[PDB]
């Protein structure tokens, strides 16, 4: 009980002043508003002065109301899958002096069996391959050895075709690449095929900027360590390498047996089975690599913005399940320990606990210390303050400066095609191999060809001028937030990929642009 808003018209006839009168007059005269005059005439009940006095009053409210670490040289061993590239790489591994090694010789001999397939330093390594079957691959892609000149990383292409991806896009580009060939008639004729994965395994390498190659002829012993077969082998193996792009004069050929160990550790005087060869041994040839001068100490190969691709994510004690150990390649820039790396995808960051440059050495447990690495090098990092989920492979890490690195779904790529059985139809599915990632993709559409609209046949690139093997739009079938990737231009190992239909590799290309 409150506010009395009667009176309202009823009173006008009760008192008898009409009201359509004062209205106009005052209003105009004065110059305020309506509503006040009706209230005031009720509140002084039909007055005409005291309400006007109030009005003369009213408006009155006034509104109306450094130090250089020396390498330490990395190599990738390449080969068909049956030359005994493993038997030969394990012999280079053995103990880097050698023998003494007395436990490891026994342990290799234990590795099914101590009596069965008997042993001479390598047969025993081969029996470690037969045990290792039983959980596919028991020894590591980490391997290192030393020589009189240098400390060597080997990563050894399989064994069932996977470690060749562990080198290129994979770690530490290779100062020198090692092609291991079988001297046998059927095995050299096989392996060597244009179609072989072996040619591809060599083809990336040459594309990558892997300038030195050493070619090692295994399994000499079956072909009686022959002069004529060896010179006949050098004569095919080289024109094959030139078709790849390699410089045949620059390539060393070393005759060897991983299986007896002749020409591996000491020169082929130790090999009485060949008297005619006079030249260096397979460690002597690998060691033969020219030392680049490390820095420019504090200096460049990217000063440019840091881009590190993540090949693999794996847990560790000190370094988490991820933001844990991370493995991949330094696409551009540089990284050093104790530094902060930022991962745009997870919007999280971490501190580099340790950095393993190329050649796989210094373990996490023993030491914690080691200086520094430029683009092109692989690293195995250790990340301190970040969580298992935070980094997945395909992510690119960088600093806050020129940070984030950006990332997405389908992309545009200038692929070039090779000799295929089938061609690429627009819409055809293929398997893309960037780094660790191998995924199904659809080459949806074929935007352009040489410069026309068509399907994509063999050997197609624009003949002259702009090169248009094919302009393509490639979409990832597998998963939303499909894949992280970078253009080749800012960094190529993130950018370069291979396309293969079933078994065969149909094409390769560079990623030109990123789309949603």
């Amino acid at each position: 009980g409150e506010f009395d808003d009667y009176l309202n018209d009823d009173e006008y006839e009760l008192m008898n002043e009409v009201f359509p009168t004062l209205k106009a007059q005052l209003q105009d005269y004065q110059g305020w508003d309506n509503l006040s005059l009706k209230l005031a005439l009720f509140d002084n009940n039909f007055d005409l002065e005291s309400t006007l006095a109030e009005l003369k009053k009213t408006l009155k409210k006034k509104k109306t109301p450094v130090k250089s670490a020396l390498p330490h040289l990395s190599f990738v061993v390449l080969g068909h899958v049956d030359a005994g590239k493993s038997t030969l790489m394990g012999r280079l591994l053995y103990d880097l002096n050698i023998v003494n090694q007395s436990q490891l010789r026994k342990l290799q001999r234990e590795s099914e069996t101590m009596g069965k397939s008997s042993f001479k330093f390598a047969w025993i390594m081969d029996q470690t391959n037969e045990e290792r079957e039983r959980g596919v691959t028991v020894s590591i892609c980490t391997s290192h050895f030393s020589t009189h000149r240098a400390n060597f990383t080997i990563v050894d292409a399989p064994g069932h075709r996977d470690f060749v991806p562990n080198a290129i896009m994979g770690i530490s580009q290779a100062d020198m690449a090692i092609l291991c060939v079988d001297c046998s008639t059927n095995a050299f004729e096989s392996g060597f095929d244009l179609d072989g994965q072996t040619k591809e395994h060599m083809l990336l390498a040459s594309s990558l900027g892997i300038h030195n190659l050493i070619i090692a002829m295994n399994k000499m012993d079956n072909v009686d360590w022959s002069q004529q077969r060896f010179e006949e082998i050098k004569s095919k193996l080289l024109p094959y390498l030139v078709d790849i792009g390699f410089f045949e004069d620059n390539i060393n050929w070393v005759p060897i047996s991983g299986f007896s160990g002749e020409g591996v550790y000491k020169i082929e005087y130790t090999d009485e089975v060949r008297q005619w060869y006079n030249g260096p041994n397979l460690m002597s040839t690998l060691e033969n690599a020219a030392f680049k001068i490390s820095k420019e100490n504090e200096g460049i190969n990217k000063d440019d913005p840091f881009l590190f691709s993540v090949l693999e994510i794996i847990p560790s004690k000190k370094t988490s399940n991820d933001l844990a150990l991370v493995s991949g390649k330094l696409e551009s820039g540089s990284i050093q320990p104790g530094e902060s790396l930022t991962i745009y995808p997870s919007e999280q960051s971490c501190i580099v606990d340790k950095i393993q440059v190329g050649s796989q050495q210094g373990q996490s447990t023993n030491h914690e210390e080691t200086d520094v690495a430029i683009k092109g090098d692989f690293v195995t990092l250790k990340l301190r303050k970040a969580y298992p989920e935070d980094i997945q492979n395909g992510d690119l890490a960088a600093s806050v400066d020129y940070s984030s690195i950006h990332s997405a779904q389908c992309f545009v790529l200038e692929l070039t095609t090779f000799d295929m059985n089938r061609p690429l139809l627009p819409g055809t599915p293929f398997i893309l191999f960037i780094g660790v990632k191998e995924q199904p993709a659809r080459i949806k559409r074929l935007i352009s060809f040489i410069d026309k609209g068509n399907t994509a046949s063999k050997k197609k690139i624009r003949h002259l001028g702009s090169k248009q093997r094919a302009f393509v739009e490639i979409e990832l079938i597998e998963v939303k937030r499909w894949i992280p990737l970078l253009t080749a231009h800012e960094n190529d190992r993130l950018g370069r990929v291979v396309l293969r239909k079933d078994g065969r590799t149909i094409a390769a290309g560079k990623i030109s642009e990123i789309t949603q």
Binding site: H160, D162, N421, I431, P440, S448, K452, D502
Partner: protein, 386 residues
């Protein structure tokens, strides 16, 4: 599937009145390609329970909606089809009776109640899948498992599709420094155990006849003895009796791709259990042999396929039910003309059903393609593209 009635009214020669019963998810996919938007479906539901408001208050009943169709929620793997609509209301009081007019309504399909389709564009292609497949004998027999060195996928080869069931995966050995930190082996054992458990649950040695195991590498062979080890541990005679439904194969990639490498490639399957997989595998084979050997005898695309029909040059016209029922009616007037035009210049025809791998493969080619009798170089200039 079971069809209770199916009738042909007397003032309307075309469309129909279908009363029908889906029996499994292969019949949920058939129904899919039959219902069109604006067709009217009449079901039972349980649309009981209310606000409060006057009274508590409700009742129950068992009220059926004659609902106009407007859209669909379809997930084949999840064995779920639902049709969204507004009530037709009903209709005279003769139907919808009890239903409250003004209220969208949906029908989530069950294998136990029949329902009736008041159909407008009931065609001979639909009638084939409603009286052939509709296949009260059922010949589709297959399950797969594709596996890389690190991921595996339980799958189900369907009367069209390579439907995933379970994108399993464990912590795969990456080759550790030491002799292989027993971590690798332990991790591998857990994995063997994991798939076995999955397949044991997912599969049912009662309706299936083929199980395909494929991998790049020994991984498929390993998984087959791991499958049967753990069977002989559980004494699982749903798997041990059927040691002869398993077939171990190699494929380039251990992703879904491997399925179309094994099925359509004459490596494994020939004419073993192939019935609904027959023909359709070979023709899609040859199509990619031809197009892809850059011989101009295999073509894709509405333009090029209409062009290859002006020369009469078509030997096998390829179309899909995915582009057909994918949504639209007018567009198929042309695609019929286009078959007749090409055959009147040359060819048979092959329609791919369509959640299928083969139909998806042709869907990824615009749901239209052809195989020719002769080389026609440049059918893609004149008309402008590739």
């Amino acid at each position: 599937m079971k069809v209770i009635s199916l009738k042909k009214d007397s003032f309307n020669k075309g469309g129909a009145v279908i009363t029908l019963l889906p029996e499994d998810k292969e019949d949920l996919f058939t129904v899919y390609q039959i219902v069109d938007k604006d067709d009217e479906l009449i079901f039972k539901k349980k649309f009981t329970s209310k606000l409060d408001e006057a009274g508590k208050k409700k009742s129950t009943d068992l009220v059926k909606l004659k609902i106009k169709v407007i859209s669909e929620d379809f997930d084949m793997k999840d064995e779920y089809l639902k049709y969204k609509g507004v009530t037709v209301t009903d209709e005279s009081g003769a139907s919808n009776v009890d239903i409250p007019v003004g209220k969208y309504l949906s029908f989530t399909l069950d294998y136990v109640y029949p329902f009736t389709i008041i159909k407008q564009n009931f065609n001979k292609f639909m009638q084939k899948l409603l009286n052939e497949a509709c296949n009260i004998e059922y010949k589709s027999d297959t399950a797969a498992v594709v596996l890389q060195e690190g991921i595996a996928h339980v799958c189900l080869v369907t009367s069209s599709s390579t439907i995933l069931k379970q994108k399993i995966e464990y912590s795969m050995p990456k080759k550790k420094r030491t002799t292989d930190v027993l971590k690798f082996d332990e991790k591998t054992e857990k994995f063997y155990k994991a798939i076995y458990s999955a397949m044991k649950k997912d599969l049912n040695f009662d309706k299936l006849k083929t199980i395909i195991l494929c991998s790049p590498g020994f991984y498929a062979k390993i998984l087959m003895d791991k499958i049967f080890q753990y069977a002989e541990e559980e004494h699982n005679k749903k798997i041990l009796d059927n040691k002869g439904m398993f077939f171990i194969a190699h494929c380039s990639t251990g992703y879904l791709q491997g399925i179309n490498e094994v099925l359509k490639n004459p490596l494994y399957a020939s004419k073993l259990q192939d019935t609904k997989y027959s023909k359709e595998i070979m023709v899609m084979d040859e199509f990619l042999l031809h197009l892809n050997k850059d011989d101009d005898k295999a073509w894709y695309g509405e333009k090029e396929v209409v062009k290859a029909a002006e020369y009469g040059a078509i030997s096998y016209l390829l179309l899909t039910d995915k582009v057909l029922h994918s949504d639209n009616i007018a567009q198929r007037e042309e695609y019929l003309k286009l078959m007749d035009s090409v055959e009147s210049n040359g060819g048979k025809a092959l329609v791919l059903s369509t959640l299928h791998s083969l139909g998806e493969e042709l869907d990824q080619l615009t749901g239209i393609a052809c195989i020719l009798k002769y080389p026609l170089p440049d059918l893609d200039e004149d008309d402008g593209e590739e």
